[PDB]
Each structure stands twice: as structure tokens, then as C-alpha cells.
Amino acid sequence: PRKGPAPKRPVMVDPVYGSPLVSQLVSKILLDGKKTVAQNIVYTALEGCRAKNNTDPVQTLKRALDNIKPSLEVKSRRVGGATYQVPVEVKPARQTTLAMRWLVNFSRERREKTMAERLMNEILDASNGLGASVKRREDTHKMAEANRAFAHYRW
Amino acid sequence: ARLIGVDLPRDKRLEVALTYIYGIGRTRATETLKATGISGDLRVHELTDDQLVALRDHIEANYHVEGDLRREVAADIRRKIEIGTYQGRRHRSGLPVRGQRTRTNARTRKGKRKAVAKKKAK
Amino acid sequence: PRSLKKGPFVDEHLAKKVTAQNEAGTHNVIKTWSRRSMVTPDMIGHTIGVHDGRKHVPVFVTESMVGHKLGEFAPTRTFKGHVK
Amino acid sequence: KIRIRLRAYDHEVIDSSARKIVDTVTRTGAKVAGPVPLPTEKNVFCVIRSPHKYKDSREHFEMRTHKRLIDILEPTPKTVDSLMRLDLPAGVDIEIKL
Amino acid sequence: GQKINPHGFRLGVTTDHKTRWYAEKQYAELVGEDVKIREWLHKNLERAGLSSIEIERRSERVTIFLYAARPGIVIGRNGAEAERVRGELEKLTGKQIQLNILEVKSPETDAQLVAQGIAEQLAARVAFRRAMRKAQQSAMNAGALGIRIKCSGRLGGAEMSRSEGYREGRVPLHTLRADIDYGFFEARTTFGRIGVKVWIYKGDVT
Amino acid sequence: AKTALKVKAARKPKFGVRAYTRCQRCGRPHSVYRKFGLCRICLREMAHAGQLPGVTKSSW
RNA sequence: UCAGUGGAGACCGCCGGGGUCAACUCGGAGGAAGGUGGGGAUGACGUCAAGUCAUCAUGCCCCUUAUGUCCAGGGCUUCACGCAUGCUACAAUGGCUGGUACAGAGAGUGGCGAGCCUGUGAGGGUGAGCGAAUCUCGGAAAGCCGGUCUCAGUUCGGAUUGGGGUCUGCAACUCGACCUCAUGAAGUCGGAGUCGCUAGUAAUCGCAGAUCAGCAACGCUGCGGUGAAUACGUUCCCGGGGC
RNA sequence: GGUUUGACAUGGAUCGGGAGUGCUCAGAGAUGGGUGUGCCUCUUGGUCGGUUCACAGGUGGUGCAUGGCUGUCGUCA
Ligand SMILES: CON(C)Cc1ccc(O)c2c1C[C@H]1C[C@H]3[C@H](N(C)C)C(O)=C(C(N)=O)C(=O)[C@@]3(O)C(O)=C1C2=O
Ligand SMILES: [Mg+2]
Ligand SMILES: [Mg+2]
Ligand SMILES: [Mg+2]
Ligand SMILES: [Mg+2]
Ligand SMILES: [Mg+2]
Ligand SMILES: [Mg+2]
Ligand SMILES: [Mg+2]
Ligand SMILES: [Mg+2]
Ligand SMILES: [Mg+2]
Ligand SMILES: [Zn+2]
């Protein structure tokens, strides 16, 4: 807004796994205002993760988030009579938000039956380095590199 | 050709395979199962002919089904047409019969929108 | 529809007119505004001019009419189609 | 014993009437339970502000009924006569349950 | 066009209701008789000049306070007019009416009578500017802290409608603790009618 | 409203179901409150003028 | 605890910095609450010959065995179409089914009706109680838990149509709601374009009231339940403010 | 399809005692015809009747003749 940066609500931690990441994940799933449904989905996905690999589900979620985190992304610019795609570096909070949003959206887009282990499959694939989320991260980075010539328009 | 005139779809529970019959709904199928004393949670491909024909006999005895009910419904509509009631006139016109509004949509009876050219403003 | 335990509704003057017609010969047209009334077997074979808003359109009541109201056979709106 | 229900639209006159009743009965001995306040009836009316074609702007009104309760523990027929003969403001009514 | 009634705005806060009775099964019929009483009194006692009609009820008995500038018309000769209006009131309602008529200490300060007088002058075809200035000057001679008068309509018998107004002092319409008396009347002329509205800031109240 | 309509509404109907309310001050047939008769406009103006006991503006 | 009367409490008042000072501003303590704490009421001078002669009132004009007025029937509910506001959806964060938690705000004597009996049910028959912080509406739903369906134009969706009914009403043909049996349409997330929202908000979940015999209410005004994401910023779009 | 001082007001006269209604008949109903019941004071009122007389009635016109009320720019400064 014009007035200034609005305050941010503090992020709570998940009672079970003790990480703000899982709370952010459930709040991102969180369709229709059904917190209990969303975190049932999230807990089921994390338990499926620890079932298929011995490593900790919170650690595998973290690894997936780092594999989906974008470093820079392009935004539209109205310089002159044509629009430009100016690449801009992404702050850690913004990139965590982008990673979570992409993870959730592509989990919803996956072909498997149930959301819980659609999200589980997507998390495992991202942690390994595969999947639609990682593909989108690579594509956005590729397009930022293609339009890298406009790094001097940053303000 | 499993039941009267319809083939029950394999790998589907009996309680809904029965509803697959014309003239049989959810509650009608449930009654039928309770009368015949046949479970409803077993797939159709495990159905012995004796219980199959017992179910067929119960349905045929109690219920108007398939061609019979279809002919009865067509006869009722034709009777409305030939008597000339308001409902019959709406049936002939292919327009809603149960006092539905026809100004805005009435679409499931009027078919797809056949848009027409109208007067043009200046 | 009307409750069964209340019986059919015949407008109590249409009934008396059709009864008089039965007593004195079932040959006359009975003019009425009682679209409200229920067709009954006792009037079968009569001809009744049911008002439709502007004219008493005649209907010859047959066997199958009985389960219907008098006004069902006297359409009130004319459409004929849009354009021509 | 002996119920007194007071109902009005203004809590000032409700309180004044309750104080008058309790001070009267006491002046005639009769110790009496304190005036206990019942929940206030809250009727709400929404009205289109304009006389025509303006529905998004409306005015809301309430009719709040304030109710108080008095118990006359002591029978005291003298207080009975006093409570039937005294005068109360027009806005508040009285209900005596013997 | 977009201003609230000052009396309704301050109702319950500073000013009080004109009717004081309680009834929960007859409420509508008592409202109807009250409307009949007020309409009858207004229609038949214009000459006296009515500031307010205040209605009370105890038990099938109605009490009417008539705040009038000149109760001479209401009382007639030795209370004859008062008796006749009371009798008409029983005829109209069917209940025991106790009617009392009260003065207004400062009719030049009460807004309703001020609107009464301004509308009467407009009907008698006095220049509206002169009438408004006279009313304003009289109000401030009395000692009101603020006057505001607005006459709207075919002022001066013209064709277009105007909304001419006068004001000085202070009239804080937005302040609830501000004691603002509001009056309105309609001058019935040969050219429709003129709406005269008067706000008078009596002072500040708790 | 029309005077004939007002008097017809006042008089007892032929069939009980045929009765209706009418604004008892105004004659308006729409938006008439059972609690106190009157109508939308009549309620608003009379509540503002203060002739309706207990009725005040609500701003909860 | 609550009910409802009367008080207290927040004032940049205290502490520190900035601010020539000064208004303000930043941080901190205390505190339920901190910089207007949240929301409502409140709409300046005026603008648009904006709306309303149909709520009422009224100038002038017009009607006066009719443009008054009464009545029955009809219409305001039409349907090649177009727009607009909504509702239900297109399913698995879901459908069905059994069990089991947690509300608020309201209404009620031609009314709210418990309980019992009867019916598949709408309902019917009896029928207490309550003019109501007492009695009734009453069940909250979402949710949780168990079972089941297994991606299927479906056990999604519930339009339409056929049968049998109930209730209100003098009367449900035109033109009512509801129950039940059967029927099972389009719809696979929607083109250009466009809308709402900055927090207990959006999203969703049910509940109550006004009018009202009944009800086409999915509307309107309220009520609580669950409960987010994001705001770098003013470059651009729309509206506005000072010079 | 009925009605014409009218469905409803207010006031003068003029003939009055019932008005107003119960049951029936005809009618789609309005309405009309039956039949029962029939003022309280008082010698001059309440109530109604006609005939009139005044008059009523209009959701008929003009929101660009108006009042009132409201939207709106705009919670804008
Ligand atoms: C036609 O008669 N002559 C020529 C002038 C005229 C005369 C008398 C009137 O009483 C009006 C008018 C013009 C119309 C125009 C209307 C129109 N509207 C109906 C869409 C409009 O475009 C607006 C607007 N958007 O602002 C208006 O102003 C409007 O509503 C209005 O006020 C009007 C009137 O009533
Ligand atoms: Mg009605
Ligand atoms: Mg303010
Ligand atoms: Mg205009
Ligand atoms: Mg007119
Ligand atoms: Mg319509
Ligand atoms: Mg009550
Ligand atoms: Mg905001
Ligand atoms: Mg205008
Ligand atoms: Mg217009
Ligand atoms: Zn009104």
C-alpha cells in the first residue's frame, strides 16, 4: 500500500514435527478454511514420506523446498511502447512462499487419486530433483537467464 | 442380458447394479435386496443363477421395469397430448409443463440457445 | 393437489347445474367461470363453456377428463409464435 | 413470595420505579429481595431509507424492553395495599403475582 | 437530501420520546389512536400554534400535554373550547382523556413555532428574506447560540425552485451532546407549498 | 393509497384468507409491520419524530 | 459464569531517541488493550432540472351514468431470444452411511409446541408447557471417528419428466410449497473480458428474523462456527486531494 | 357483468323509525327478492333512509411547478 509495509503475522510451528515449514504447508493447502482436513492431508503425506524413505519427513520436505526455491524471477515492465521481462532477485521469504505454492499446486495437478499422497509423491520427487515443481523452477530460472540483459532496470 | 433386459456391469456392487435397471432406484434396489435376502456388498460376477433368478422373479412380480414402464410413461404423455390439457399442450410445444418460468432459461426443455438477430440501435 | 380427505372441489353451482341438466336431459351448454372446479363423472358427456379470461370456450367433457380441473382445457394465454 | 415484574423502555425509569417499590415495602417493614435485572428484549427493524428504488442504504431501529424482578418475602397485607395503591410513571408497567 | 433528523439522531441520547406508555398486545392500535389524536389536533388547532403533543397512558386513560404558544385559542372562553376539544377527543378515541395545555416560555426560541411563524408569513406573502431575517434576529435577541433557517420551494411565487437559507452563530448538527431543537412547517401558498426548516442551538447538555 | 381500497381493506373480507394489512397511517400495502402497524416510511418518520416509545436508532 | 445498572481504564500519560525546538515520529515499560484498539451511528457548501405526483402532501391541467366505484374470471408467472444478480454443480480436501462433539443471535397465544401413538415420509391424531433467562422452536452444520464407494459422465451432478400423496386456503388449471416412487439432462472448471476482499477479513458452514394462511426465500437484514494467502512497492490502470 | 351524492367523508334541509343483521331464494359474484328480529331519550337527541343540495372520488397528467424523503460524487478534506 501507499502508507508502508504492512505488518506480517507471525508463523506458528507444527505441534507434531516442531517446524514452521509444516505449518506453512498446511496453511497453504488449507482449502475452504478446513484446517483439520488440510493438516490430516499433510500429516498423511509426511508419514508416507517417512514410510518410503527412512529419512525424516521434515528433512525431506526441506530438501524439496530447497530444490523448488527460485533464485530470481522476471516481472513485467512498462518501459517504452513494449513490455519487458526484468529479472529480479527473490528474497528468502518470497522464494519459500513460491516453492510452497508451486509444490501445492502441482500436487493438486498430479494424476494420482488422493491429495494426501499426490502431495507425498510430489514431495519425494522434488526432493530427489524431479517433478513438475522442479521443472517450473528450472523454466523460470531459464527465462530469467534469457532476459538477464535487463538486470540494470532494477530500482 | 443379465437381468430383465439389461446387463449388470461386472465388478460393480449389486446394490447399484440393481439401480442400473430402468424403473429401479436406490431405495427400490435396497428393498429388493432385503426382500430377496441377498447381500448388496458383493460384486455381480459372484452371483449364482438361483439367487439371480430369485431376484429377477421378485423384481418382475413387484415392479414395473424396463419396457413396460417406458411404454406406460409414453402412454401417459400421449394421453395428456390427446386429452389436450395445459400440460399436454406444453408437452406438444416441447416446453416446461410444471409451471416453470420460460422467460429467461427453460433450457433443458428448449434445447440449446438458437440466438436470433434483433433490432439494432443507432 | 387437493387433500384426498377433503374430497374433490366442485364449485357447488356447477354441480347443481350439471345435476339439473342430468335430470332434465343431458343436452345444453353450461356456461361457467369455474375454472376452479374438478371434473366429475356425473358431468361426463356434457359441454361446459369454461371462461378463459375473455370468452367461454366450450369443452366437451369425455371419460378421461375426470381427473382434471375445468380450467386445464381453457388456455388463457395466446402465443402463436414470435415473429411470423 | 409475591412477584413484582417491572417492564419499560428506559432503564432510568425502570431503576427509579424499582427503588420506589423497594423503599415503600421496606418503609412498611417487609424485607424484599433486591431488584434483579432480566435480559432486555431486543427487537430490530431494518427499513429502506428512501421511499423508492434505493435499497442499499437502510436505517436500523431497536425497541429495547428492560425488565426487573422484585420478590416480597414478607406477606405484609399493609404492603399489599401500598403496592396496589401507589402511583408509577406511565412508561413503566407493573405485574403483581400473588 | 442526505441529512438526518436532529431529533431522531439525538433521540435517547439527549432528547426524549413524545409518547410514554408500555403495551405489548395493542401496541399497534394505541399507535393508531395516537396518530388520530395528533392529526386531529394539528388539523383543528393551527391557530394556537402547536410546539408538541405529548401522550401518556396508564390504564385505558390517555393524558395529552399540548405545548402551545398561545393557549388562548385552545381554552376559548372559560375553558369552553378546552371542554369541546376534550369531548371531541373522547368521541374520536373512546377513552378517558385528561388534557392539559402548557405554555412555551420562549416561542421565539422554540424552532417549531419559529417555522410556524415563517410559514404563516410566507403564506401571507411576505418577502422571504425579510421573514427569515426577522426570525433570526428575534432568536438571537432571545439568546439562542445559533440559528439556521432554510426555505425551499417556489419562493416568491417563481417558477424555478430555490433553497434560500440564513444562519449565524453556531449550529453543530454533528455533535450529539449539542442541544439542537428542530422544527419544520409548510407554507401553503397559491403556488404549491414552501418547506421551512429551522435549527436552533439551545446550548450544550450532558 | 386509494380511499376505496383503504375502506375495503378495513371492512371484514368475504373469505378470511382475503384480508391484508395496509399502513394504518398511510394506506401503503407494502412493508407493513405487525408490531405497530404503519409502514416503511411511516415507521422511519415517526421513529425519528419520537412518537413511537422504545423505538430508537440502532448502531450496535 | 452470566444477566444489567453505575464506576474505573488509554491520555503519546511514563522512559529513551529523532524532531532548531514544535507539532509529530521511532523504540520500550506497564497493561486486557498503544499511538484512532475493532465496528456502527453520524454524510460539510454543493453537484447531477439525479429518483420518487405510486408512501404521503401539493400548484396547475384533465375524468365525472366515467380516467369514479363494486364483482367474477384473466394478467402481472407469456418465450425464437439478450443482459444482470444469485444458487447448485462439474466430484475423492469428495459422495453415501452409522456414531459422536462445540454456538451465537433471535421468535412465540388464530402463536411456539414438547411427549406418546400412527405413517416410508411430508404429515395426521391426541396433546402438556410457555406471553416466556423458566416452555417451545432445538437439530446447530462444517468437524472428529468407523464403514463404504475407487476416478467411472460415476454411488459426481439433480435438471427435466411420469405416478402416488400431504398441508395451507372459499380455491393450488393457469400459478404454491413439501413428501415419496421412478426418470437421471447439461456440466470434465468455463472465450474475450470482468468482480470481491488487507484479519477473525476472504473462503466456506449452518442458524434466526422481517413480510407471511401458505410460499416460488437460492432474496434481504442479522448471528455465530471453521478460518487463510499476500501487500517488494507507486512505474502503469481507475477515482480523488493540496499547490 | 353491476352501480351513479356514488365504495368512503363533511354539512344543511326533508320524510322517518329502526339501523344493522340471522335463515332462505336467484346469481360467477356484485347485487336483487324473501323471512325472522327489531332504536335509546323524549314531544324535542343518538341512528339511518331517500330526494336532492352542497359535494365526494382518481395509483389520471406534469419529479423540468413543488414540499418531504433518498441516491450520488464522498468518510472525500
Ligand atoms: C426528455 O425531455 N427533455 C428532452 C429533457 C427533460 C425534460 C424534463 C425532464 O423531467 C427530464 C428531461 C431529460 C431526461 C434525461 C434523463 C435520462 N435518463 C432517463 C436515462 C438521462 O440520460 C439522465 C442521466 N443519465 O443523468 C437524466 O438526467 C434524466 O434522467 C432526466 O433527469 C430527464 C428528465 O426527467
Ligand atoms: Mg395475504
Ligand atoms: Mg464524526
Ligand atoms: Mg429527470
Ligand atoms: Mg394526483
Ligand atoms: Mg413480475
Ligand atoms: Mg414476546
Ligand atoms: Mg482497507
Ligand atoms: Mg429532480
Ligand atoms: Mg422518471
Ligand atoms: Zn405509510
Side-chain angles (χ1 to χ4, degrees), chain D residues 3 5 7 11-12 15 36-44 46 49-55 58-60 66-68 95:
Chain D
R3 283 276 175 84
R5 266 75 167 263
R7 285 193 258 286
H11 72 267
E12 292 83 302
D15 267 4
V36 65
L38 294 174
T40 81
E41 178 167 2
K42 182 67 180 294
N43 304 148
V44 170
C46 187
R49 211 185 277 253
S50 164
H52 197 270
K53 69 175 286 293
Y54 292 123
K55 205 173 186 185
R58 300 184 188 181
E59 217 169 355
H60 287 249
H66 307 262
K67 330 191 180 174
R68 256 61 155 182
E95 172 176 341

Side-chain angles (χ1 to χ4, degrees), chain F residues 21-39:
Chain F
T21 44
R22 289 270 182 205
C23 167
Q24 65 171 252
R25 183 178 182 270
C26 180
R28 196 185 166 98
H30 270 292
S31 82
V32 168
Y33 291 84
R34 293 180 181 177
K35 175 71 211 171
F36 62 87
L38 309 173
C39 76

Side-chain angles (χ1 to χ4, degrees), chain C:
Chain C
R2 191 173 155 94
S3 277
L4 281 176
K5 74 175 185 293
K6 270 168 83 94
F9 176 78
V10 167
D11 205 74
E12 182 65 26
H13 47 75
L14 207 53
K16 293 182 183 293
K17 292 181 181 180
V18 298
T19 294
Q21 207 57 64
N22 278 169
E23 294 294 328
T26 308
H27 289 288
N28 189 358
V29 55
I30 319 186
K31 175 168 113 192
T32 196
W33 297 259
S34 182
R35 306 180 54 101
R36 192 170 70 177
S37 179
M38 187 66 203
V39 182
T40 48
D42 63 358
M43 71 180 69
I44 283 188
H46 277 111
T47 187
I48 296 169
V50 180
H51 193 228
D52 76 334
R54 68 173 147 173
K55 64 182 181 293
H56 286 272
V57 75
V59 298
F60 182 73
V61 61
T62 79
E63 190 276 331
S64 51
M65 306 294 210
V66 177
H68 300 300
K69 293 306 192 85
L70 277 296
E72 286 214 271
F73 294 98
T76 55
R77 275 163 281 225
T78 61
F79 180 57
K80 301 296 182 181
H82 293 286
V83 288
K84 285 286 288 182

Side-chain angles (χ1 to χ4, degrees), chain E residues 98-116:
Chain E
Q98 188 274 331
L99 161 69
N100 52 5
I101 306 97
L102 303 187
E103 298 278 339
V104 292
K105 299 289 94 176
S106 49
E108 63 274 339
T109 305
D110 172 320
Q112 191 47 65
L113 269 298
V114 162
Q116 183 67 41

Side-chain angles (χ1 to χ4, degrees), chain D residues 18-29:
Chain D
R19 284 197 300 285
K20 183 174 181 343
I21 301 299
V22 65
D23 81 21
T24 299
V25 289
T26 50
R27 101 208 355 164
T28 26

Side-chain angles (χ1 to χ4, degrees), chain A residues 77-125:
Chain A
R77 195 54 190 162
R78 191 66 263 176
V79 164
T83 179
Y84 296 124
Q85 293 179 176
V86 179
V88 183
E89 182 65 26
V90 182
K91 296 172 166 54
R94 178 91 157 88
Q95 65 183 178
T96 303
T97 293
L98 275 195
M100 282 285 213
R101 175 178 315 140
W102 294 341
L103 182 65
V104 168
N105 276 7
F106 290 121
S107 297
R108 283 174 191 170
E109 294 294 328
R110 282 197 68 147
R111 178 70 275 172
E112 190 277 331
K113 305 294 97 175
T114 185
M115 178 79 211
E117 62 87 19
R118 284 181 289 177
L119 160 74
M120 182 278 288
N121 278 329
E122 181 65 26
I123 279 175
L124 290 179
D125 293 358

Side-chain angles (χ1 to χ4, degrees), chain B residues 1-9 16-25 28 55-56 59-75:
Chain B
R2 297 292 299 274
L3 264 293
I4 297 93
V6 65
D7 45 346
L8 267 55
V16 305
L18 272 189
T19 81
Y20 266 47
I21 304 183
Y22 193 96
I24 303 286
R28 206 76 88 85
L55 186 143
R56 186 273 304 278
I59 284 186
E60 183 178 1
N62 296 49
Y63 294 161
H64 283 129
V65 161
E66 271 322 311
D68 273 11
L69 195 149
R70 216 162 307 151
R71 261 184 315 270
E72 175 197 320
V73 162

